[PDB]
Scaffold this active site. Structure first.
Site, PDB file in Angstrom:
ATOM      1  N   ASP A   1      27.303  40.377  47.821  1.00 59.44           N
ATOM      2  CA  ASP A   1      28.504  40.604  47.022  1.00 59.44           C
ATOM      3  C   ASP A   1      28.632  39.607  45.865  1.00 59.44           C
ATOM      4  O   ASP A   1      29.200  38.524  46.023  1.00 59.44           O
ATOM      5  CB  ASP A   1      29.771  40.585  47.886  1.00 59.44           C
ATOM      6  CG  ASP A   1      31.029  40.886  47.088  1.00 59.44           C
ATOM      7  OD1 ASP A   1      30.900  41.305  45.913  1.00 59.44           O
ATOM      8  OD2 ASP A   1      32.129  40.692  47.637  1.00 59.44           O
TER       9      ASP A   1
ATOM     10  N   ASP B   1      30.015  43.378  39.946  1.00 60.27           N
ATOM     11  CA  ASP B   1      30.577  43.322  41.289  1.00 60.27           C
ATOM     12  C   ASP B   1      29.823  44.260  42.232  1.00 60.27           C
ATOM     13  O   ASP B   1      30.126  45.448  42.312  1.00 60.27           O
ATOM     14  CB  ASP B   1      32.069  43.690  41.251  1.00 60.27           C
ATOM     15  CG  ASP B   1      32.740  43.512  42.600  1.00 60.27           C
ATOM     16  OD1 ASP B   1      32.083  42.958  43.530  1.00 60.27           O
ATOM     17  OD2 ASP B   1      33.907  43.940  42.719  1.00 60.27           O
TER      18      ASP B   1
HETATM   19  C1  LIG Z   1      33.083  35.787  41.773  1.00 61.12           C
HETATM   20  C2  LIG Z   1      34.418  36.076  41.146  1.00 61.12           C
HETATM   21  C3  LIG Z   1      35.449  34.989  41.090  1.00 61.12           C
HETATM   22  C4  LIG Z   1      35.642  36.166  42.009  1.00 61.12           C
HETATM   23  C5  LIG Z   1      36.675  37.168  41.579  1.00 61.12           C
HETATM   24  N1  LIG Z   1      36.336  38.451  42.155  1.00 61.12           N
HETATM   25  C6  LIG Z   1      37.073  39.581  41.867  1.00 61.12           C
HETATM   26  O1  LIG Z   1      38.118  39.586  41.219  1.00 61.12           O
HETATM   27  C7  LIG Z   1      36.484  40.810  42.428  1.00 61.12           C
HETATM   28  C8  LIG Z   1      36.587  42.112  41.673  1.00 61.12           C
HETATM   29  C9  LIG Z   1      37.365  41.931  42.944  1.00 61.12           C
HETATM   30  C10 LIG Z   1      36.989  42.711  44.167  1.00 61.12           C
HETATM   31  C11 LIG Z   1      37.249  44.200  44.016  1.00 61.12           C
HETATM   32  O2  LIG Z   1      37.391  44.689  45.360  1.00 61.12           O
HETATM   33  C12 LIG Z   1      37.747  43.599  46.240  1.00 61.12           C
HETATM   34  C13 LIG Z   1      37.881  42.374  45.342  1.00 61.12           C
HETATM   35  C14 LIG Z   1      37.567  41.049  46.004  1.00 61.12           C
HETATM   36  S1  LIG Z   1      35.866  40.998  46.617  1.00 61.12           S
HETATM   37  C15 LIG Z   1      34.968  41.918  45.477  1.00 61.12           C
HETATM   38  N2  LIG Z   1      33.640  41.930  45.619  1.00 61.12           N
HETATM   39  N3  LIG Z   1      35.554  42.603  44.504  1.00 61.12           N
END
Ligand SMILES: C[C@@H]1C[C@H]1CNC(=O)[C@@H]1C[C@H]1[C@]12COC[C@H]1CSC(N)=N2
EC number: 3.4.23.46
Length: 389
Positions: A232, A36
């Site tokens: 991201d 992440d």
């Molecule tokens: C690509 C994949 C399917 C998505 C799920 N993403 C998450 O659960 C990310 C860990 C969680 C978080 C942690 O801070 C904010 C939250 C949303 S955006 C971000 N980059 N990270």
């Protein structure tokens, strides 16, 4: 040049995330961890949950240290609570080093863990400024660099399959590479082009121009970076600020107008399906994002295909159709270059030189007529003006 130990160390997909194997504690406890780049905490499931097949058991680690401090982490969609501590951490398919790192042990959560994702925690690779509960909690990569000789750089090749993977196939399949401390030349073609990291919090960049099939979206460039633009890996979609999203969708609809798609498709909610093999890639436009270059008055562009921004999904019905969701969506928190756009490119997070590199990925999905591209230079004036304050 070559980092064979780390090549092919990722698994997963854009819709559920890409993850790397890590170990925590003594003796080592193996966990799959989301990569992440849009957050800064190392946080792992540490208590039973219906969607976790395993979790960190602090009581079984001889090297566990309790920091005696809770953390409450609410997101837009989802939340968790946890307890801060430290422990020894390794990446098996990684540098041959063990470091002592901060770990947030997740004890309660809501809509955070994803059923079937196969990951049990998240590795926040961004900077301390956005760590929770504050910037004094050193992120993992900071610890790694401080405690070892690992160069202050990592690079990501996320590999979209171009078709749906069942949970059997997703476990068996290589999803890409995280090269810790280096750049592997096998993972890309052509040249790497670098954009400055504007500020070390998120991996923030500046977009200076947007084209849909070569046609300038023609917005004030500040709109593209309102209120920031970030890279991201923990977001599925390319997310665009509301005004940019509305303009881009209008342009993509116009380019693709030989076929009409329902509102739910453009809203990213509803799939569209075509007979096996007949997806009309050629009717959808390419999208070019121009990024600020390292040289004064110079930009470069990255170009993605519909094979990137149409995310393959399984049919709701039972069929041999090829089905997709539109993986561009609106944001109220700035541009997010998520996993679907990263799948086009080998992306170098050059922390040491405060820059992000892009090259065409050796694993990007394309057709016989078009490929993703990274091209430059272009003369572009007043690029700092594109940054929102
Ligand atoms: C690509 C994949 C399917 C998505 C799920 N993403 C998450 O659960 C990310 C860990 C969680 C978080 C942690 O801070 C904010 C939250 C949303 S955006 C971000 N980059 N990270």
């Amino acid at each position: 040049g070559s980092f064979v130990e780390m090549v092919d160390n990722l698994r997963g997909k854009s819709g559920q995330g890409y993850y790397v194997e890590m170990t925590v504690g003594s003796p080592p406890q193996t966990l799959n961890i989301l990569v992440d780049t849009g957050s800064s905490n190392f946080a792992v499931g540490a208590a039973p949950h219906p969607f976790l097949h395993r979790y960190y058991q602090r009581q079984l680690s001889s090297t566990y240290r309790d920091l005696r401090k809770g953390v409450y982490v609410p997101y837009t969609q989802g939340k968790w609570e946890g307890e801060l501590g430290t422990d020894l951490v390794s990446i098996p398919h990684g540098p041959n080093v063990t470091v002592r790192a901060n770990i947030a042990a997740i004890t309660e959560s809501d809509k955070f863990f994803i059923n079937g994702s196969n990951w049990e925690g998240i590795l926040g690779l961004a900077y301390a400024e956005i760590a929770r509960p504050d910037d004094s909690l050193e992120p993992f990569f900071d610890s790694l660099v401080k405690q070892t000789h690992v160069p202050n750089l990592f690079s990501l090749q996320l590999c979209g399959a171009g078709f749906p993977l069942n949970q059997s196939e997703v476990l068996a399949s290589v999803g890409g590479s995280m090269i810790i401390g280096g750049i592997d030349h096998s993972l890309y073609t052509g040249s790497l082009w670098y954009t400055p990291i504007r500020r070390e919090w998120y991996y923030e960049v500046i977009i200076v121009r947007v084209e849909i099939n070569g046609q300038d979206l023609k917005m004030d460039c500040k709109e593209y970076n309102y209120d920031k633009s970030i890279v991201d890996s923990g977001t599925t979609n390319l997310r665009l600020p509301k005004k940019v999203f509305e303009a881009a969708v209008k342009s993509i609809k116009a380019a693709s107008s030989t076929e009409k798609f329902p509102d739910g498709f453009w809203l990213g909610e509803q799939l569209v399906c075509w007979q096996a093999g007949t997806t009309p890639w050629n009717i959808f436009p390419v999208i070019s994002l121009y990024l600020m270059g390292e040289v004064t008055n110079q930009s470069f562009r990255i170009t993605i295909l519909p094979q990137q921004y149409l995310r393959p999904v399984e049919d709701v019905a039972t069929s041999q159709d090829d089905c997709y969701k539109f993986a561009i969506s609106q944001s109220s928190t700035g541009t997010v270059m998520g996993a679907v756009i990263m799948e086009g490119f080998y992306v170098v997070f050059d922390r040491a030189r405060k820059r992000i590199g892009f090259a065409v990925s050796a694993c990007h999905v394309h057709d016989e007529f078009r490929t993703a591209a990274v091209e430059g230079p272009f003369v572009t004036l007043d690029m700092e003006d594109c940054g929102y304050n």
